[model samples]
Target: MSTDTGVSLPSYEEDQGSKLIRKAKEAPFVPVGIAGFAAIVAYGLYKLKSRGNTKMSIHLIHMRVAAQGFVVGAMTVGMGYSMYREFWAKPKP
Candidate 1:
C-alpha cells in the first residue's frame, strides 16, 4: 500500500479555485456583494411563490434595495477591517 499524498506529486499549481481564493482575499468584498445579491434575489423568488398573487413591480425594487443594503454593509465592514489593519494591527517595535 503506497501512501502517496499531494506533496509526493509534482507540486501542481495555477488552478481555478486558487485564483478565485486569491482574488477574494485581495478585495474580500466582491464575492460577498455578489453572494448577497444572489441570496436576496433567490429569497425574493421564494417569496414569489405566494399562491401566484403578487406584483412584479415592487418586488424587483425590493430585491434591489436588499442588494444595495448588503453591498453597502460589506463595504463598511471592509473599510472597518482596513482601518483595523492599518491602525491597530501594527507591531510597535
Candidate 2:
C-alpha cells in the first residue's frame, strides 16, 4: 500500500495575497495608512508583552502609543507624497 500525498491546486492570479496588498497599495492614502499602522501597532504590542507589561492598562497604552505614533508617521509620509504629487509635480493634462 502506498501513502497518498496532498496535491495542490493552482489558484487564480487575482486570488494571491500579494495581489491584494498591491491593490491596497495603489489606493490613495487611508487604506495604506491603516495597514501600515496595524503592522506597527502589532509590533509594539508584541514588544510590550515581551517586556513583561502584563496589565491591561499597559497593553492599552502600548496600543495607543502605536496608534498615535505609527498612524501619524504613515500619514506624514502619505500626505507629503500627496502634496508633492498634487502641487509640485507637473500635471499630465
Candidate 3:
C-alpha cells in the first residue's frame, strides 16, 4: 500500500482483534449522532402533538428548542470526537 508520504507501505492482514479495535475506535460518534437525532425528532413530534388545536403562538419556542438541542448535541459530539482523536487515539503503524 502507498501512504501519503509517497512511499510503499507494509501490508498487514486485519484479523478479528484488529477489526474489533477499528470498530471500538469508531463507535462513540455513531451512537451520539443516532441518539441526538432521535431525541430532537421525538421531541418535535411530541410538541406538535401536544400543541394541536391551539394557537401557533408557542410553536416557535418548540422549534427553537429542538433546533438548538440538535445543533448543540451534534456540535458537542463532534468536538468530543475531535478531542478524543487528537488526545486519546492510539493508531498503530
Candidate 4:
C-alpha cells in the first residue's frame, strides 16, 4: 500500500532587481560618466566626417578605448570625491 498526491502545489520564482537601482542612487556619477563616455565616442568618431581619407578600424578602436579610459578615470575620481563627502567632508552651512 502507498499514498500519492494527485497534484503538486504551484511554485514561482523571481530575481531581485532593486539592488541595481539602490547602487545607482548611491553613486550617481557612474551613470553620468557612462553617458558622457557614450557621447564622447559618438562625437569623436564624427570628427572624421567629410574627409576623403583619415584612418581605419584602428582609429575607431583608439577612440573607443580613449573614451572608456576617460570614463574609468572619471568614475575613479568621482568615487573618491563621494567618499570624501560621506566620511570626511564638513557640512556646508
Candidate number achieving the greatest TM-score relative to the actual structure: 2
lDDT of 3 by residue, 1-93 (tens): 223442333766545544544544454657756866688666656656745653434444546565667667778777767534555545679
Report, for every candidate in turn, its global Cα lDDT versus the true structure: 0.59, 0.59, 0.58, 0.56
lDDT of 3 at 42: 68
lDDT of 2 by residue, 1-93 (tens): 224323434655445555544564463657656776787677666756745654444344446575667657777877767534545434577
Worst 10 residues of 4 by lDDT: 1-10
Clashing pairs in 4: none
Model 2, residue 61: what's the lDDT?
A: 45
Preferred candidate (TM-score higher): 2 or 4: 2
Point out the higher-scoring one by lDDT: 1 or 3: 1
Tens digits of per-residue lDDT, candidate 4, 16-88, equal 4354234544435566667766776776566557474545344444454675676568776776675445454
Q: Where is model 1 poorest over a 10-residue stretch in terms of lDDT?
A: 1-10
- Cα displacement (angstroms), candidate 3, residue 21, comes to 21
Q: Could you tell me the lDDT of residue 52 within candidate 4? A: 45
- What is model 1's C-alpha RMSD? 12.4
Q: How well does each candidate superpose onto the true structure, as a TM-score?
A: 0.29, 0.36, 0.32, 0.28
